[PDB]
Design a protein around this ligand. Structure first.
Ligand SMILES: [Zn+2]
Ligand SMILES: [Zn+2]
Length: 51
DNA sequence: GCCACCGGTGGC
DNA sequence: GCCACCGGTGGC
């Protein structure tokens, strides 16, 4: 299988802007991680099978 | 080139 | 043995 995509319909997916205050927003330059408030509810579940 | 998922792992 | 952290890179 392939990498999973965001769902588009949970509250975080619907957020227009980054929150600007979580650990990942404060470390924008460094982080390869999405704003904690934009993280898709569906992607917080571990993959049923890995890659 | 950017966004950001996710396998791999160091420190506990 | 867990898991927060990271960084390579898939997908656009
Ligand atoms: Zn944030
Ligand atoms: Zn979502």
């Amino acid at each position: 299988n392939k990498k999973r995509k965001r769902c588009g319909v949970c509250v975080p997916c619907l957020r227009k802007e980054p929150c600007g205050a979580c650990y990942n927003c404060v470390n924008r330059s460094t982080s390869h991680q999405i704003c904690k408030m934009r993280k898709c509810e569906q992607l917080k579940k571990k993959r049923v099978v890995p890659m």
